[PDB]
Design an enzyme around this catalytic site. Structure first.
Site, PDB file in Angstrom:
ATOM      1  N   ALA C  20      87.396  36.921  23.124  1.00 11.03           N
ATOM      2  CA  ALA C  20      88.208  37.370  24.537  1.00 11.03           C
ATOM      3  C   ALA C  20      87.646  36.183  25.376  1.00 11.03           C
ATOM      4  CB  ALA C  20      87.580  38.468  25.074  1.00 11.03           C
ATOM      5  N   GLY C  21      88.033  35.038  24.790  1.00 13.83           N
ATOM      6  CA  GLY C  21      87.911  33.676  25.650  1.00 13.83           C
ATOM      7  C   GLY C  21      89.075  33.198  25.963  1.00 13.83           C
ATOM      8  N   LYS C  67      82.739  39.855  28.232  1.00  8.69           N
ATOM      9  CA  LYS C  67      83.912  39.409  28.163  1.00  8.69           C
ATOM     10  C   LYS C  67      85.015  40.474  27.773  1.00  8.69           C
ATOM     11  CE  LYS C  67      83.512  34.207  27.533  1.00  8.69           C
ATOM     12  NZ  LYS C  67      83.850  33.165  26.554  1.00  8.69           N
ATOM     13  N   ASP C 112      85.933  30.118  18.182  1.00  8.50           N
ATOM     14  CA  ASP C 112      85.504  28.833  18.570  1.00  8.50           C
ATOM     15  C   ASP C 112      84.959  28.251  17.493  1.00  8.50           C
ATOM     16  OD1 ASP C 112      83.364  30.221  19.055  1.00  8.50           O
ATOM     17  OD2 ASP C 112      83.251  29.300  21.136  1.00  8.50           O
ATOM     18  N   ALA C 116      82.582  31.982  12.035  1.00  7.94           N
ATOM     19  CA  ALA C 116      83.000  33.358  12.288  1.00  7.94           C
ATOM     20  C   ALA C 116      84.383  33.240  11.700  1.00  7.94           C
ATOM     21  CB  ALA C 116      83.043  33.628  13.715  1.00  7.94           C
ATOM     22  N   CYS C 165      65.490   8.858   9.621  1.00  4.16           N
ATOM     23  CA  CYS C 165      65.266   7.570   9.850  1.00  4.16           C
ATOM     24  C   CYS C 165      65.706   7.064  11.118  1.00  4.16           C
ATOM     25  CB  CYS C 165      65.527   6.727   8.734  1.00  4.16           C
TER      26      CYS C 165
HETATM   27  N1  VB7 Z   1      87.469  29.158  22.660  1.00  4.13           N
HETATM   28  S1  VB7 Z   1      86.532  30.228  23.829  1.00  4.13           S
HETATM   29  O1  VB7 Z   1      85.023  29.609  23.797  1.00  4.13           O
HETATM   30  O2  VB7 Z   1      87.219  30.072  25.159  1.00  4.13           O
HETATM   31  O3  VB7 Z   1      86.491  31.474  23.482  1.00  4.13           O
HETATM   32  C1  VB7 Z   1      85.735  32.074  22.042  1.00  4.13           C
HETATM   33  C2  VB7 Z   1      85.286  33.269  22.043  1.00  4.13           C
HETATM   34  C3  VB7 Z   1      84.805  33.859  20.545  1.00  4.13           C
HETATM   35  C4  VB7 Z   1      83.555  34.639  20.948  1.00  4.13           C
HETATM   36  N2  VB7 Z   1      82.934  34.654  19.703  1.00  4.13           N
HETATM   37  C5  VB7 Z   1      82.671  35.836  18.846  1.00  4.13           C
HETATM   38  N3  VB7 Z   1      83.253  36.889  19.009  1.00  4.13           N
HETATM   39  C6  VB7 Z   1      83.008  37.976  18.320  1.00  4.13           C
HETATM   40  N4  VB7 Z   1      82.247  37.784  17.111  1.00  4.13           N
HETATM   41  C7  VB7 Z   1      81.771  36.707  16.638  1.00  4.13           C
HETATM   42  C8  VB7 Z   1      81.727  35.698  17.747  1.00  4.13           C
HETATM   43  C9  VB7 Z   1      81.223  34.294  17.301  1.00  4.13           C
HETATM   44  O4  VB7 Z   1      81.532  33.264  17.964  1.00  4.13           O
HETATM   45  C10 VB7 Z   1      79.921  34.271  16.428  1.00  4.13           C
HETATM   46  C11 VB7 Z   1      79.020  34.973  16.291  1.00  4.13           C
HETATM   47  C12 VB7 Z   1      77.989  34.586  15.524  1.00  4.13           C
HETATM   48  C13 VB7 Z   1      76.603  35.554  15.352  1.00  4.13           C
HETATM   49  O5  VB7 Z   1      76.837  36.962  14.830  1.00  4.13           O
HETATM   50  C14 VB7 Z   1      75.474  37.654  14.809  1.00  4.13           C
HETATM   51  C15 VB7 Z   1      75.060  37.831  16.337  1.00  4.13           C
HETATM   52  C16 VB7 Z   1      74.791  36.401  16.700  1.00  4.13           C
HETATM   53  C17 VB7 Z   1      73.994  36.103  17.817  1.00  4.13           C
HETATM   54  C18 VB7 Z   1      73.986  34.881  18.543  1.00  4.13           C
HETATM   55  C19 VB7 Z   1      74.829  33.859  18.264  1.00  4.13           C
HETATM   56  C20 VB7 Z   1      75.514  34.058  16.859  1.00  4.13           C
HETATM   57  C21 VB7 Z   1      75.666  35.371  16.370  1.00  4.13           C
HETATM   58  C22 VB7 Z   1      78.099  33.442  15.048  1.00  4.13           C
HETATM   59  S2  VB7 Z   1      79.652  32.765  15.517  1.00  4.13           S
HETATM   60  C23 VB7 Z   1      82.816  33.631  22.139  1.00  4.13           C
HETATM   61  C24 VB7 Z   1      83.865  33.329  22.794  1.00  4.13           C
HETATM   62  O6  VB7 Z   1      84.292  34.046  24.250  1.00  4.13           O
END
Ligand code: VB7
Ligand code: ZN
EC number: 2.3.2.-
Lengths: 52, 311, 490
Positions: C20-21, C67, C112, C116, C165
């Site tokens: 939701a970005g 978000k 992003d 994922a 290194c």
């Molecule tokens: N292009 S943007 O930055 O403007 O927007 C992108 C959006 C995507 C959102 N990310 C998201 N949403 C739902 N599920 C997964 C994700 C991920 O990006 C990831 C999550 C993980 C992983 O899951 C388990 C718990 C956890 C905790 C901390 C870090 C990672 C994880 C890996 S990738 C973000 C943004 O609005």
């Protein structure tokens, strides 16, 4: 063939001879197109983006 | 530097793309947008987020029952409100740093002096006569002129930035691009042996545009799906008369085109509004080569084509 | 508005938006305005001020909230009748499984990062549900369609890091110093990792948390050990400095005695040394209340990395860099604007309408260019490619081959740096084909090599992820000739 690869950034690069063409570019992860279809003339290069 | 720390925090991700100087140029610019239907709403949102100094949203019409029930800038149940006023609260709230204003008078009735207060002027849903009139006004006063519209799966943008100087990263190189009057853009001679050759490579969307501008001229409105059968037949006649009048085969524009050019499709508004707003941003900040002079989008085929037409 | 069958489909079924970005907010708006009457939206993040230039459903007052949650509330203000379910959560979470995925007639990514994306790909294969994939960065972006048994999947085609290194002994670019500063932050406050060592490498071919605890994390002491002591011991290793310019150690006391935005200015050596002081104090305090994880937006952590790296740059005769610049590089910040995301979201819905209309044949990969190609195309549509039959993800009975030292590579290293990272499994169960190695829950006492398990050049492992309904067979090649800890055999 004296060919040109144009990239999305408008980066014009001359070449002449999956292949070796790409191998020089890949050193400067991409995809290669000739007037529509995947691979004095022009090759277009497209990169996949991962932002969102 | 020339902006506050809150602005820097807000604009961070676009400063890292186009530079603080580009952003400062945005911050000094004021834009007139006419028409707050689907495409105007998209352009409005994009320009306000980008952080122009001011946007004036001009629409003299009201929300009608035929208009979509969801509109991202207008609350549900605003039938009968002026469409600009109905858009103001949501538009303004996108970016409090922007001075967003509303004007409710018919653009046609505006004196030439109304225009001089703006760095760029963008027209949606306007008749051919109004497009030519305002483009002439903008040329006199060196104001960036733009127009665009959406119709079903298609849309187009047009720019006249006169003689336009900009920087572009090869370090920044200064460059100059020359645009032509919209009247010339819309009235190409296809007689020339040159033009006969240009025609083979010209997208048919340009002829689509001529058909729809003529419909708009003749009917006071655009095709509407409520009147699909009525409007289809007229569009087919307009295709014959328009293309016959230019010395082109009617068949360049296929006879089923009527299926694909009705109404505002939200995704088509998003696409054309993103391209148009970004050209406006480029023009105002004098960074990157702008498209000279038309962009034609076909959402059926996923084509977006820049044509230089007029000279 | 739409052909009756399409309209019915769109009003009928349920769609999933992942993210939701930038793309996601635009896409949510477009789906609702287009008539999609059932939408689930998942995103794991909260709203940050820097989101506000392009994530238009969020205002400043919403900073800190979810978000997905704010997105849904913003939409309901212009269309109360939308049905939207918002999850503040990661798609990677085991609750979102094949039967969850089976609910949807269309999944759309608005992610992003690759990991994922990989996970969702696998989910959509398992559930046999069409996936629209997309991304953006700057002025560029693209959209494509993924359908099981018709197209390439996300990982059908092949999609970096620097040696210890160059980071410990031989930096030549600001990025080495930046990576070093990052390592130094983890080693001090975060998760200790051997791969992230900071003390000069005693075993170089061209030729830490313990220590800082015992000083009560003293600015002046750390400074001296890192910027003075360590550059001296590195100056011992004389072979390196025959060719390249020697590093110049930094005395704390000597140092103390010596327009764009605020963040764009390069400060003097004394200031970054002071900023190194200040931030270390702040981080030591908030390490007691709340292992810490590095985030570019945590003021003190960013300050820490900024100062550390700029000191290290100075030591090695490189010009120091503005915090703004170090933010891009350490954060890996993608420049991002409203219009690119708006165009891509618009395309996503158009592709989606083609799919649910049964016109997938008309779907395209579409690239958005900055400037027209030679045929004048600013949007460049391409044919969908068929499945690669040698894809390690979507092909029947996938297999791959890994070349690693069987005696000197942990069961932890396999679970982590390989089956999880490289192969993007999340809930993996690995078993030697002949002896359960790794488990879903359990086998926590295995991490400590593989050799001592029956594993040798030519043994087979069956990796599952029952969440992803994915099975990968891994063929093992022994070797001790690797640079490097492993290579995917190509
Ligand atoms: N292009 S943007 O930055 O403007 O927007 C992108 C959006 C995507 C959102 N990310 C998201 N949403 C739902 N599920 C997964 C994700 C991920 O990006 C990831 C999550 C993980 C992983 O899951 C388990 C718990 C956890 C905790 C901390 C870090 C990672 C994880 C890996 S990738 C973000 C943004 O609005
Ligand atoms: Zn595949």
């Amino acid at each position: 063939i004296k060919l040109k690869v144009i990239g999305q950034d408008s980066s014009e690069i001359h070449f002449k001879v999956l292949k070796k063409l790409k191998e020089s570019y890949c050193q400067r992860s991409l995809r290669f197109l000739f007037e529509g279809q995947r691979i004095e003339d022009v090759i277009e290069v497209y990169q996949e983006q991962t932002g969102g | 530097g020339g902006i506050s720390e809150e602005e820097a925090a807000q604009y961070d991700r676009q400063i890292r793309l186009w530079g603080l100087e580009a952003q400062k140029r945005l911050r000094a610019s004021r834009v007139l947008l006419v028409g707050l239907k689907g495409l105007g709403a998209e352009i409005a949102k994009n320009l306000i987020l980008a952080g122009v100094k001011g946007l004036t949203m001009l629409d003299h019409e009201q929300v009608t029952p035929e208009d979509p029930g969801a509109q991202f800038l207008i609350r549900t149940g605003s039938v009968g409100r002026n469409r600009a006023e109905a858009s103001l609260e949501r538009a303004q709230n996108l970016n409090p740093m922007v001075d967003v204003k509303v004007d409710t008078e018919d653009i046609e009735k505006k004196p030439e002096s109304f225009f001089t207060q703006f760095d760029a002027v963008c027209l949606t849903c306007c008749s051919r006569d109004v497009i030519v009139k305002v483009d002439q006004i903008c040329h006199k006063n060196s104001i960036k002129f733009f127009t665009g519209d959406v119709f079903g799966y298609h849309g187009y943008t047009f720019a006249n930035l006169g003689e336009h100087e900009f920087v572009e990263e090869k370090t920044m190189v200064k460059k100059k691009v020359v645009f032509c009057p919209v009247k010339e853009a819309l009235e190409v001679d296809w007689s020339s042996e040159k033009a006969k050759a240009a025609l083979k490579r010209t997208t048919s969307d340009y002829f689509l545009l001529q058909v729809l501008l003529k419909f708009r001229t003749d009917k006071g409105r655009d095709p509407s799906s409520d009147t699909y059968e009525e409007d289809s037949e007229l569009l087919l006649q307009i295709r014959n008369d328009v293309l016959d009048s230019l010395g082109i085969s009617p068949d360049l524009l296929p006879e089923d085109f009527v299926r694909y050019c009705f109404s505002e499709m939200a995704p088509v508004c998003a696409v054309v509004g993103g391209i148009l707003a970004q050209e406006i941003v480029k023009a105002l900040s004098q960074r990157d080569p702008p498209h000279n002079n038309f962009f034609f989008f076909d959402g059926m085929k996923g084509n977006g084509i820049v044509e230089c037409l007029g000279p | 508005g739409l052909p009756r069958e399409l309209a019915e489909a769109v009003a009928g079924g349920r769609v999933l938006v992942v993210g939701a970005g930038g793309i996601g907010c635009e896409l949510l708006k477009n789906l609702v305005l287009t008539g999609f009457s059932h939408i689930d939206l998942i995103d794991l993040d909260t709203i940050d001020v820097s989101n506000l230039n392009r994530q238009f459903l969020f205002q400043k007052k919403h900073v800190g909230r979810s978000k997905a949650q704010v997105a849904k509330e913003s939409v309901l203000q212009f269309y109360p009748k939308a049905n939207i379910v918002a999850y503040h959560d990661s798609i990677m979470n085991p609750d979102y499984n094949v039967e969850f995925f089976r609910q949807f007639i269309l999944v759309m990514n608005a992610l992003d990062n690759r990991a994922a994306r990989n996970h969702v790909n696998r989910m959509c294969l398992a559930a046999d549900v069409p996936l629209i994939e997309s991304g953006t960065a700057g002025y560029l972006g693209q959209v494509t369609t993924i359908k099981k048994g018709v197209t390439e999947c996300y990982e059908c085609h092949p999609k970096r890091t620097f040696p210890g290194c160059t980071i410990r002994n031989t930096p030549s670019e600001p990025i080495h110093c930046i990576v070093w500063a990052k390592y130094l932050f983890n080693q001090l406050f975060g998760e200790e990792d051997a791969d992230q060592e900071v003390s000069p490498d005693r075993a170089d071919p061209e030729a830490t948390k313990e220590w800082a605890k015992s000083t009560g994390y003293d600015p002046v002491k750390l400074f001296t050990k890192l910027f003075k002591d360590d550059i001296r011991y590195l100056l011992t290793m004389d072979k390196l400095w025959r060719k390249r310019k020697p590093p110049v150690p930094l005395d704390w006391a000597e140092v103390q005695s010596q327009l764009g935005l605020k963040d764009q200015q390069v400060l003097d050596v004394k200031s970054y040394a002071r900023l190194f002081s200040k931030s270390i104090e702040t981080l030591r305090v908030h390490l007691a209340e709340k292992e810490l994880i590095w985030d570019k937006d945590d003021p003190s952590a960013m300050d820490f990395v900024t100062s550390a790296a700029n000191l290290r740059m100075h030591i090695f005769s490189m010009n120091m860099k503005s915090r703004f610049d170090i933010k891009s590089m350490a954060g890996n910040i993608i420049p991002a604007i409203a219009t690119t995301n708006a165009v891509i979201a618009g395309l996503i819905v158009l592709e989606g309408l083609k799919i649910l209309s049964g016109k997938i044949d008309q779907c395209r990969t579409i690239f958005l260019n900055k400037q027209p190609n030679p045929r004048k195309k600013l949007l460049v549509p391409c044919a969908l490619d068929p499945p690669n039959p040698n894809c390690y993800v979507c092909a029947s009975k996938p297999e791959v081959t890994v070349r690693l030292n069987v005696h000197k590579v942990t069961v932890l290293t396999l679970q982590d740096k390989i089956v999880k990272e490289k192969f993007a499994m999340v809930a993996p169960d690995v078993q030697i084909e002949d002896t359960i190695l790794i488990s879903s829950e359990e086998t926590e006492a295995n991490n400590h090599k593989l050799s001592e398990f029956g594993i040798r050049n030519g043994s087979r492992l069956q990796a599952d992820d029952f969440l992803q309904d994915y099975t990968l067979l891994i063929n093992i090649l022994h070797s001790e000739d690797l640079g490097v800890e492993f290579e995917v055999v190509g």
